[PDB]
Design an enzyme around this catalytic site. Sequence first.
Site, short mmCIF file in Angstrom:
data_model
loop_
_atom_site.label_atom_id
_atom_site.label_comp_id
_atom_site.label_asym_id
_atom_site.label_seq_id
_atom_site.Cartn_x
_atom_site.Cartn_y
_atom_site.Cartn_z
N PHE A 1 1.20 10.57 1.56
CA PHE A 1 0.53 10.08 2.77
C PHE A 1 1.51 9.12 3.49
O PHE A 1 2.16 9.52 4.45
CB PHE A 1 -0.81 9.42 2.41
CG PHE A 1 -1.57 8.83 3.60
CD1 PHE A 1 -2.42 7.74 3.40
CD2 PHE A 1 -1.46 9.35 4.88
CE1 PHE A 1 -3.15 7.18 4.46
CE2 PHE A 1 -2.17 8.79 5.93
CZ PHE A 1 -3.03 7.71 5.72
N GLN B 1 3.07 1.44 3.36
CA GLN B 1 2.69 0.42 4.34
C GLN B 1 3.09 -0.98 3.86
O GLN B 1 2.83 -1.35 2.71
CB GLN B 1 1.17 0.49 4.59
CG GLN B 1 0.54 -0.76 5.22
CD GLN B 1 -0.90 -0.56 5.71
OE1 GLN B 1 -1.48 0.54 5.57
NE2 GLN B 1 -1.48 -1.62 6.27
N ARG C 1 0.88 -1.16 0.00
CA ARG C 1 0.00 0.00 0.00
C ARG C 1 0.91 1.21 0.00
O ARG C 1 1.65 1.43 0.95
CB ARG C 1 -0.92 0.01 1.23
CG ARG C 1 -2.40 0.10 0.92
CD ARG C 1 -3.12 1.33 1.47
NE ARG C 1 -3.14 1.39 2.91
CZ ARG C 1 -3.86 2.26 3.64
NH1 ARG C 1 -4.66 3.16 3.06
NH2 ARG C 1 -3.78 2.25 4.96
N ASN D 1 -3.16 -0.97 11.56
CA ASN D 1 -4.10 -1.70 12.38
C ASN D 1 -5.54 -1.60 11.85
O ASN D 1 -5.84 -0.79 11.02
CB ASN D 1 -4.02 -1.25 13.85
CG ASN D 1 -4.60 0.15 14.10
OD1 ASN D 1 -5.72 0.46 13.72
ND2 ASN D 1 -3.83 1.00 14.77
N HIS E 1 -2.62 5.09 15.97
CA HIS E 1 -1.52 4.24 15.55
C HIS E 1 -0.31 4.47 16.40
O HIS E 1 0.08 5.61 16.65
CB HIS E 1 -1.23 4.49 14.07
CG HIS E 1 -2.41 4.18 13.21
ND1 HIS E 1 -2.73 2.89 12.85
CD2 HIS E 1 -3.42 4.96 12.76
CE1 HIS E 1 -3.87 2.90 12.18
NE2 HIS E 1 -4.30 4.14 12.11
N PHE F 1 3.88 1.18 8.82
CA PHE F 1 3.92 2.16 7.76
C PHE F 1 4.88 3.27 8.09
O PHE F 1 5.26 3.44 9.24
CB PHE F 1 2.51 2.65 7.39
CG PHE F 1 1.81 3.44 8.46
CD1 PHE F 1 1.83 4.84 8.43
CD2 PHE F 1 1.07 2.81 9.45
CE1 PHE F 1 1.16 5.60 9.38
CE2 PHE F 1 0.41 3.56 10.41
CZ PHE F 1 0.45 4.97 10.38
N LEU G 1 -4.07 10.69 12.53
CA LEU G 1 -3.67 9.35 12.96
C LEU G 1 -3.21 9.34 14.42
O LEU G 1 -2.97 8.27 14.98
CB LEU G 1 -2.55 8.81 12.07
CG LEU G 1 -2.87 8.53 10.60
CD1 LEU G 1 -1.63 8.00 9.90
CD2 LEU G 1 -4.02 7.57 10.40
#
Length: 171
Positions: free
Chosen positions: A67, A70, A62, A106, A130, A117, A126
């Site tokens: 951004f 991951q 990902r 998660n 996280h 990530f 976030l």
Amino acid sequence: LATATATLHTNRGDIKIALFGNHAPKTVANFVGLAQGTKDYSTQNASGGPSGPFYDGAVFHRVIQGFMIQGGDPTGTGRGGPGYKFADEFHPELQFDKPYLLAMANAGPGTNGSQFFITVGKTPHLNRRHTIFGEVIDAESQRVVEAISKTATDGNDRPTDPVVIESITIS
């Protein structure tokens, strides 16, 4: 802050990351454990086998530009893990106010496994969702992470050219 260093040796370059063992002791201990083959995981590793270094052959599945990147799923699908869940570790001194932060992916509270990530920008939404447990040290590693984030991807944000974690040195 840092109590140990990890280098992700990828096919697109090395990423040296400082690990925050005193702020997120269980998360760092989990990452280091999997990286070295020391942790007792109950699924298969990214090489399809029962033991040894867990992340070798793992992809960043990902990638979303500006951004984060991951990876750390042994199946490379985004649904996998090492066969267990464990608690989050939020620390008031750690928040998403700079780029190049290592954190745990998660599916909501208490669902950390193996996927992590690296942010490529500020991501304050976030905060307290996280676990932050690391930060990329040098400027060259930040560039590799940057280049990885800019790679071409399909409609599911999976890179068309696989970004592969070949191995991980701890020190």
